[PDB]
Amino acid sequence: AQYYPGTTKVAQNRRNFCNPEYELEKLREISDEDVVKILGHRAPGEEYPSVHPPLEEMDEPEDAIREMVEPIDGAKAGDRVRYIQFTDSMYFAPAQPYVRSRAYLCRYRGADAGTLSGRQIIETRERDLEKISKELLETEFFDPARSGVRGKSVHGHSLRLDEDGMMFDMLRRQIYNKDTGRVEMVKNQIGDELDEPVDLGEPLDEETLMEKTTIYRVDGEAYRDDVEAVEIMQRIHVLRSQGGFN
Amino acid sequence: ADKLFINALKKKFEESPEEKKTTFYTLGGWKQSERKTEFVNAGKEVAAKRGIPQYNPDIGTPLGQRVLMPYQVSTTDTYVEGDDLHFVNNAAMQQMWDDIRRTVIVGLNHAHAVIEKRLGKEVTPETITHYLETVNHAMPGAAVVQEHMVETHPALVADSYVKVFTGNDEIADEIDPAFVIDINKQFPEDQAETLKAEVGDGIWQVVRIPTIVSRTCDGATTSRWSAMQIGMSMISAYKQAAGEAATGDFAYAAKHAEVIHMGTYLPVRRARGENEPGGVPFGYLADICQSSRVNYEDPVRVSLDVVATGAMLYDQIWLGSYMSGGVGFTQYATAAYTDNILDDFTYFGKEYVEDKYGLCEAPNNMDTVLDVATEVTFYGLEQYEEYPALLEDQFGGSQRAAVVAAAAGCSTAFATGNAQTGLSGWYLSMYLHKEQHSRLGFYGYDLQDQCGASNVFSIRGDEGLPLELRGPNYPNYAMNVGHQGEYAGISQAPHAARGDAFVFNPLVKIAFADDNLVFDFTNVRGEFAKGALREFEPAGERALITPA
Amino acid sequence: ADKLFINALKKKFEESPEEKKTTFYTLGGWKQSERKTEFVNAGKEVAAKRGIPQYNPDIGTPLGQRVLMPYQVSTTDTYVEGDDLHFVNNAAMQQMWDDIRRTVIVGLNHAHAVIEKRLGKEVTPETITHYLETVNHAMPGAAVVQEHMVETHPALVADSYVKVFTGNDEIADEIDPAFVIDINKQFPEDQAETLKAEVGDGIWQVVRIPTIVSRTCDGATTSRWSAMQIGMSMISAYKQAAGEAATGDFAYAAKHAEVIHMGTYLPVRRARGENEPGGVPFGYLADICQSSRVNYEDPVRVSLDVVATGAMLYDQIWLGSYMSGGVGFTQYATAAYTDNILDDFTYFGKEYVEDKYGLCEAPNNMDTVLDVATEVTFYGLEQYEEYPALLEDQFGGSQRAAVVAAAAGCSTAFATGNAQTGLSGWYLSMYLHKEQHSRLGFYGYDLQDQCGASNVFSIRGDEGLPLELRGPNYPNYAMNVGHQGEYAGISQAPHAARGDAFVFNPLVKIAFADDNLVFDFTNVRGEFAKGALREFEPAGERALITPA
Amino acid sequence: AKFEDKVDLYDDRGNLVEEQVPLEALSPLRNPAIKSIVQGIKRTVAVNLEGIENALKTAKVGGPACKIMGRELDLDIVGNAESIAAAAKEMIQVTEDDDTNVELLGGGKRALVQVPSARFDVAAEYSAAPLVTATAFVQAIINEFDVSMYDANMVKAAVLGRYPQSVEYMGANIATMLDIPQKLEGPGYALRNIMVNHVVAATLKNTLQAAALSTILEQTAMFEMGDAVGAFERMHLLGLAYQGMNADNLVFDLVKANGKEGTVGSVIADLVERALEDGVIKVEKELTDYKVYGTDDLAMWNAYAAAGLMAATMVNQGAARAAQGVSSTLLYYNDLIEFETGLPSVDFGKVEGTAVGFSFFSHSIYGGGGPGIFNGNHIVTRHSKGFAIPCVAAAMALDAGTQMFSPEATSGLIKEVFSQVDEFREPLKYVVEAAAEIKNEI
Amino acid sequence: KTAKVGGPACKIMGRELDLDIVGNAESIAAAAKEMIQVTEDDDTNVELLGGGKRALVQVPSARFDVAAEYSAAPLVTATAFVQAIINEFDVSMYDANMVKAAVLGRYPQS
Numbered sequence A: 001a002q003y004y005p006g007t008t009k010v011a012q013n014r015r016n017f018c019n020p021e022y023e024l025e026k027l028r029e030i031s032d033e034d035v036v037k038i039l040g041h042r043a044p045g046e047e048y049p050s051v052h053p054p055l056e057e058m059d060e061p062e063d064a065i066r067e068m069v070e071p072i073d074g075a076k077a078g079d080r081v082r083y084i085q086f087t088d089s090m091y092f093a094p095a096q097p098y099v100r101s102r103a104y105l106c107r108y109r110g111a112d113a114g115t116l117s118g119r120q121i122i123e124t125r126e127r128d129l130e131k132i133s134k135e136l137l138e139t140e141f142f143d144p145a146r147s148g149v150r151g152k153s154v155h156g157h158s159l160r161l162d163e164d165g166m167m168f169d170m171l172r173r174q175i176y177n178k179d180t181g182r183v184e185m186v187k188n189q190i191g192d193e194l195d196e197p198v199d200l201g202e203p204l205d206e207e208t209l210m211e212k213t214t215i216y217r218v219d220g221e222a223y224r225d226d227v228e229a230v231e232i233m234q235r236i237h238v239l240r241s242q243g244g245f246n
Numbered sequence B, C: 001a002d003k004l005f006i007n008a009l010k011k012k013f014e015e016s017p018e019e020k021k022t023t024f025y026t027l028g029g030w031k032q033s034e035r036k037t038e039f040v041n042a043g044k045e046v047a048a049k050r051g052i053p054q055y056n057p058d059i060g061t062p063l064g065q066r067v068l069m070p071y072q073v074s075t076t077d078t079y080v081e082g083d084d085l086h087f088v089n090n091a092a093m094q095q096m097w098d099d100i101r102r103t104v105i106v107g108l109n110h111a112h113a114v115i116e117k118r119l120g121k122e123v124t125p126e127t128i129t130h131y132l133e134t135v136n137h138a139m140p141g142a143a144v145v146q147e148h149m150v151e152t153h154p155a156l157v158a159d160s161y162v163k164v165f166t167g168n169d170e171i172a173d174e175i176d177p178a179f180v181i182d183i184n185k186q187f188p189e190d191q192a193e194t195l196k197a198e199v200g201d202g203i204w205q206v207v208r209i210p211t212i213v214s215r216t217c218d219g220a221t222t223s224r225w226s227a228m229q230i231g232m233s234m235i236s237a238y239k240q241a242a243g244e245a246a247t248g249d250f251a252y253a254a255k256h257a258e259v260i261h262m263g264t265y266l267p268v269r270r271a272r273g274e275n276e277p278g279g280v281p282f283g284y285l286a287d288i289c290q291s292s293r294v295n296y297e298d299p300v301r302v303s304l305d306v307v308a309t310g311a312m313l314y315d316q317i318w319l320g321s322y323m324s325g326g327v328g329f330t331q332y333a334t335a336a337y338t339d340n341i342l343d344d345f346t347y348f349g350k351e352y353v354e355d356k357y358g359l360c361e362a363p364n365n366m367d368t369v370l371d372v373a374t375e376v377t378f379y380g381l382e383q384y385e386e387y388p389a390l391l392e393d394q395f396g397g398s399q400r401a402a403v404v405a406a407a408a409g410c411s412t413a414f415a416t417g418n419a420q421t422g423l424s425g426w427y428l429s430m431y432l433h434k435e436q437h438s439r440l441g442f443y444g445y446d447l448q449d450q451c452g453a454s455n456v457f458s459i460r461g462d463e464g465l466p467l468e469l470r471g472p473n474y475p476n477y478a479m480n481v482g483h484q485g486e487y488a489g490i491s492q493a494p495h496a497a498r499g500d501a502f503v504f505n506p507l508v509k510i511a512f513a514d515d516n517l518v519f520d521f522t523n524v525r526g527e528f529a530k531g532a533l534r535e536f537e538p539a540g541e542r543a544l545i546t547p548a
Numbered sequence D: 001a002k003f004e005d006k007v008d009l010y011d012d013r014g015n016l017v018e019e020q021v022p023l024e025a026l027s028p029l030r031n032p033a034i035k036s037i038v039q040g041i042k043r044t045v046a047v048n049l050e051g052i053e054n055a056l057k058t059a060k061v062g063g064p065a066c067k068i069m070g071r072e073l074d075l076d077i078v079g080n081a082e083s084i085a086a087a088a089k090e091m092i093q094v095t096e097d098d099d100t101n102v103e104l105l106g107g108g109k110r111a112l113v114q115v116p117s118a119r120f121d122v123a124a125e126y127s128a129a130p131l132v133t134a135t136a137f138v139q140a141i142i143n144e145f146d147v148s149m150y151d152a153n154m155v156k157a158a159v160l161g162r163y164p165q166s167v168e169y170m171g172a173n174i175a176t177m178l179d180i181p182q183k184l185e186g187p188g189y190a191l192r193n194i195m196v197n198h199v200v201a202a203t204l205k206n207t208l209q210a211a212a213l214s215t216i217l218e219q220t221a222m223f224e225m226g227d228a229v230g231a232f233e234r235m236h237l238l239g240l241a242y243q244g245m246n247a248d249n250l251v252f253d254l255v256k257a258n259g260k261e262g263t264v265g266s267v268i269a270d271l272v273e274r275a276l277e278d279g280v281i282k283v284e285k286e287l288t289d290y291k292v293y294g295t296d297d298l299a300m301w302n303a304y305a306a307a308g309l310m311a312a313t314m315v316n317q318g319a320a321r322a323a324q325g326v327s328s329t330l331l332y333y334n335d336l337i338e339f340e341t342g343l344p345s346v347d348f349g350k351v352e353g354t355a356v357g358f359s360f361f362s363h364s365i366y367g368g369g370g371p372g373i374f375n376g377n378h379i380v381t382r383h384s385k386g387f388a389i390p391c392v393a394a395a396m397a398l399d400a401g402t403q404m405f406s407p408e409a410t411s412g413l414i415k416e417v418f419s420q421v422d423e424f425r426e427p428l429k430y431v432v433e434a435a436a437e438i439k440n441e442i
Numbered sequence E: 001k002t003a004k005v006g007g008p009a010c011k012i013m014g015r016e017l018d019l020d021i022v023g024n025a026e027s028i029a030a031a032a033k034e035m036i037q038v039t040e041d042d043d044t045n046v047e048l049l050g051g052g053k054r055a056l057v058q059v060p061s062a063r064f065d066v067a068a069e070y071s072a073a074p075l076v077t078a079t080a081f082v083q084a085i086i087n088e089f090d091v092s093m094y095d096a097n098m099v100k101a102a103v104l105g106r107y108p109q110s
């Protein structure tokens, strides 16, 4: 597959995020337990709540499609559907809202992905969400200064940075340690305080941000200069218009 | 010269608009705001008085971790906090809607035929003036025939009256000028001649029922109220029996046959009668706005005054209350009429078109759309990239998409003289925007925008329509903020560039060229500012009948 | 003892009520009237200020060739000119409608299931109380989640709030009592036990949105505004994602699945959304009126308080404005709640039934109808024949037909305990009246009355319906004055005689047993009088955001 | 035939049934089984006798929480259902041995009622079914128990609710798949105002049968609306064949190839591959490391794209066994395919647009709800002309129990009564067989 | 010709189209009939009156067999005549929406 047109680094980065063959760079290590605490849906050690029985106990009807589509583990178990949501700064965060949604539905099974300007969300079965959330937090999808995990009060994607280069956050869920240059998450994604903060590592430097970002900007790579990408968008507009008429 | 939005950005923030970094969290939350402070103290008093907790700054998340910005009302030097632009807090925005809701246009052409042919009486300017004197007594709620009638208090209903207009200059001069909307006095000469040619010898009434009745009742009341007092005034002035068969022809004429509603009724999911905001087509809204007869030398100003009229009505009152409610959609709308941002983007596009093509001289085809809409879209987006303060000003993507696309679409229509290609440019702007920043608007912002390109030029049943005829009930458009008011501006744009006297209905255009309205439809944005400063005096209050 | 209407008649006229002769034409026309004089002067000021003539006593025929009567508001000693009972001139009758229009009932039973089953969280009285504190901040128009929100002025929306009720006393007592409608405190013990059994363990919200919003917008706004702020408060109080899939269940529940509108939408010819007067069935109106829980020892008083509620809303505001307008239908309505006339006729009928059958003990059949309805009809008409002043008081035939038939119909229902036989007696009364005096009402008064007999007991698609379920949209009833409010009384009558706590919906009955309402639904006729004296303070004014 | 196209027809297990069938043998205007389904939907009514009886016993009539004290009637309706049903049938039928049908279910608790076709030959629309059924059962009940003139109006209220004070049958104890004509968003929309949950209920959650019935109803509505007339007729017929009838086994195969490990992106890759091989699309132009695809037949590209869209729904939501993500699949399948190919998405953007609002109004405070309460007449999901709603049906069919407003919550009476009609429960079998039987008459 | 579309007194200046529809009525009617019919010998009927100023259209019974109600008649007729007029004069994509408005009015805003 080709995923996306264009000849900028931005276009290539958009392609890499979507490409399931492309190995996302791992930048940090987060414990399984700390993923659960960030998500905030259950306590580590707690059993997964269920919304319906396991599929094996349901005896569901003869249906060639059901037989042919393997459910994800959480669906077999009857897990709740829960979520993780990210806000990405327009100042060169690596991932961006439509990039995320496009990439999730190329990479992950059983995904409900939504895109907004200030938030991007994925809802799926609880135990599968935890495996996905680790990769979304450990890899280049995430920078702890220009990206944030926020289930509410998402304001920030369009705001100026603070003096440390951190994105604004109403609820100050992620804190830059000026004396050590590392970001700690001190609350879960809905804003409740954590017993012990989680280390998220060092912010990427601006040079690396520019190299990895998927946003076009005049002070990075401008969309108007990626003429092959622009041409394809104008083409879709023209063909949609003609199709609708005749 | 500086961009038009720079002054506003300098008054909002201590930093210079180009700076990328600021400080948060040390402003004191809501205490930074005079208006929020007023609200906190009022909430304590309300709670104490009624015995039920109410507004409380400690519920939910703490407002004001960033600067709570003032907003410049575009074309003015008035700066106000955004709460002063909420329709609930702004009596000028409420009166604008009341003045539309309580208005209907009713012909006298069938009525006069019934008189002459069925009753065998004569109609002369003298009998018309007598009828108009009678109906201006009757229309606010006063009696002309029966004994022992009880009546409305004239001071509570002082805003209700009836005027006429006609394209026949000779009849107009015979009628007492207190009752006449003088097309020659209210419109420039070229526009007046077009309008008079449309109206011809027809004679039309502009009826305004009382605000206090409109607020007590609904929009579907207006044409009924109007028809009953027209009927009594016809009985009285032309000496019919007070209730004979012919009386029924007048009722059918005034309620159905020669009535122009401001809005048409809506289907059941969003059930509403006539003269509600959802029934008002974009062409009508542009014609209600009177900027076109005062600012005709500047087609940007005319178009953006229409955007302001529609953004407020359609997003704040219609979508933000009639169809949802609560805190609502103030800033989805104010993005279109504050800080001179849309004006900058659209003046740029007008200069682009005028230099490359000349206004209205571009080919009306898709080549012109791809050119103008792309160039203006890239210009607008670049301003947010060069000025971090601007991006923090219009912080929601929906807001930015509406402003950029409005500039692109209006500019495209300035080039082609045709609103349908302007509409195509609106949608192309959306697609480019979405790919440039990998975001667009809220979760459901671009439902109509993805449907958009294919439905611009469609001809199928519930798809095809010229933009001027579309409105808030056009299927794709029925749900979402950040589009409807901007579409009204695109509808106005080619007609402003061409110098047309009206967009869609000349009777509507003339009916609001009336200095006895409460809201000043020639200066919509100035009126919003006056209401924000709490200096607008609405009609329909009940102070006269309540205790001190 | 005299007839209850004698004092009123002695105050209106200088002659004795039995005298057949008087003198006319010497009274000064309008100058006899302090109110008409106020109107004449106000019309001069208005015309001078705006430059268009308005109220003018010399247009049409000269009012006041006969005596312009004061009216006694029944059950009070207040006497006012009829102009003071026009809904435009009476802030109390405007607020009574606003308090209905702005109210909706919304269950919490589905919402709590979503929390426990879909989100897997717990619901307790503590989380309910926290939710109620949050929604009473949010519902008038204030924010709980997003940054940089602009909000409604708390003092402009002080009349908006949310309360709950439940049939489970122990749950009720654990919720903060500021938020609770206490069934045991508001209702007598026998009624409270009936009501608590109907509600059971369900928990229901009573939502009142701001009067200022209801007047700017329409009745169909209420359930939407309610749902938006319920949704925001559920997000905040129960720690959902601020917009996940589960959020949608709360919207559907609040907007459709457990919502009780006061009125249902109307068909296209009289197009209107929910919570407009035409959609309110007679049984709901009787249950909105709160006379049943204070005056339960006097079924006549309970039934006639409902008549007054309905005659005002249905004839004066709905039929006289929404469906027509102008001078309107004040006295078509006041005939049913002034001068203690209807009270005299209905007390006569209750005593006749008490003595002959005993309340609710008559056979529910045509024999009882022919007996009670005939006797009370003849009593009522004889009063007009024995007292010429009474006939000059209720001078229109329609007025008289509605009052006599209301007494006959209510009295019949007192006897049978069934509203349907009461309705049959209403129509029989009309037939006897018509033959006795060779007149009935206005030109179109008895459309429904001639169709009436055959449709009381019909079972066909658009004919058959128990009276309690009928309303202003029942086909025969959709157009004409002098019926709808009286039918509401007939619906109440058998249930007041039986001692029933409610007529048709127990949640509606409970929802208006609330001291924080602006209008006092326990004493509707006292409130009308208070408004007539200009002593009523309504909500929704804009004095705070307008100039001195 | 007007079109040269032919399609291979398969059954719901992936087996061939008939080869090279003219496209118009699947047309609502020609296929007799579609005619049977549409007329059956018009004329079929479910009556809830247990509910009528309980409403009368408690005088709970006229809508939620409503009750008239003193009007209670204790009648043994379920215990006399056979006699009531027979009296009703004589009133409903036009002649002895016509196509009237009245069957009792659940021991007299429910009744399936199919009003004779002759009544609709002299009717303008479809309300004769509930209204004739309602009055026949009201009269039969009154006659069975000698209900008095004074009491009979409560039986009316128990059957048809608050009508006519309400415009709808508010509180009624009868049910249809169609809603009243006043609630149409526009003329010609009636077959679209059928709730997705109703479709899933009638087909007992068989994914391909729910997709088929939904597609039949949506695309038949497009003829009534005039959308499938003239230049657009072929597009709509191809969408019906490929998206809803598993033409050429394309949907089945895409799901087979991607069901164990697939994502939306992997279904897209396979579809593009198959479209290239079958000649539907061709390389038109080369950019830098990117091929721009073109097509000489947009209607066929649309149909192929729409079949992949179905498969992607089946794969994504089938994996989660959770319907909610169908709004995401409908959006990003189309968004991804456009930047994968340079060609327009299904319905030229209208499915993507429908999915945007459908996502918002199924994950926000402002309205809508869960997927099963939507339909082609809903303001949110009316914009695509037949290509979105069948995917919602398929996704709800695959939902294992994640919805609060499930078909069991909203459509129990439909499940129990309408699933009994063979053509409603397995429409794919009957439409395909009828197409083979007429293949040489087209 | 006047751009008077969408209701009483409505007009869109600059959208005027001058097409000789009445003078080509026979060809337009024939093209529309081909779109309205289901088969070549069904009960479709299209007849010109007043010398092409008016047309009597009877949509085939078969379309109502598989329809819920009766709106197929105006809707199928309107689109066939809209398409037939566009095809007769090769009306452009940019102008065709005015033909739609002239045939069916302000629908679906109204």
Ligand code: F43
Residues within 6 Å of the ligand: A116, A117, A118, A119, A151, A152, A153, A154, A155, A156, A157, A158, B325, B326, B327, B328, B329, B330, B331, B332, B333, B395, B396, B397, B398, B399, B441, B442, B443, C142, C143, C144, C145, C146, C147, C149, C150, C228, C229, C232, C235, C242, C243, D363, D364, D365, D366
């Ligand atoms: C709960 C929702 C989901 C939903 O259905 N509506 C919400 C909330 C709602 C509430 C918020 C009031 C409150 O805070 O109590 C209101 C005011 C509607 C109401 N009920 O009166 C609203 N949004 Ni929202 N909402 C808006 C917007 C936004 C932007 C904000 C992004 C950012 O970076 O700040 C995003 C969507 C997106 O990312 O594009 C957004 C989301 C959301 N919007 C998220 C909450 C976001 C969060 O947790 O912070 N709206 C805007 O983009 C600007 C206009 C602003 C509207 C208020 C006004 O017009 O003045 C407000 C409009």
Ligand SMILES: C[C@@H](OP(=O)(O)O)[C@H](NC(=O)CCCCCCS)C(=O)O
Residues within 6 Å of the ligand: B269, B270, B319, B320, B323, B324, B478, B479, B480, B481, C224, C255, D361, D366, D367, D368, D369, D379, D380
């Ligand atoms: C969708 C529909 O809601 P329902 O699904 O019918 O509950 C519709 N609301 C809306 O369109 C909300 C529009 C205003 C809020 C969203 C602005 S983007 C309405 O209330 O009639």
Ligand SMILES: O=S(=O)(O)CCS
Residues within 6 Å of the ligand: A116, B442, B443, B444, C243, D360, D363, D364, D365
């Ligand atoms: O967050 S949502 O896009 O659902 C609503 C924005 S106001």
Ligand SMILES: O=S(=O)(O)CCS
Residues within 6 Å of the ligand: B243, C442, C443, C444
């Ligand atoms: O005279 S009429 O009966 O038509 C009207 C009475 S208000």
Ligand SMILES: [Mg+2]
Residues within 6 Å of the ligand: A029, A030, A031, A032
């Ligand atoms: Mg690890």
Ligand SMILES: [Mg+2]
Residues within 6 Å of the ligand: B518, B520
């Ligand atoms: Mg002024």
Ligand SMILES: [Mg+2]
Residues within 6 Å of the ligand: none
């Ligand atoms: Mg006697």
Ligand SMILES: [Mg+2]
Residues within 6 Å of the ligand: C515, C520
């Ligand atoms: Mg009090």
Ligand SMILES: [Mg+2]
Residues within 6 Å of the ligand: D014, D016, D249
């Ligand atoms: Mg095979």
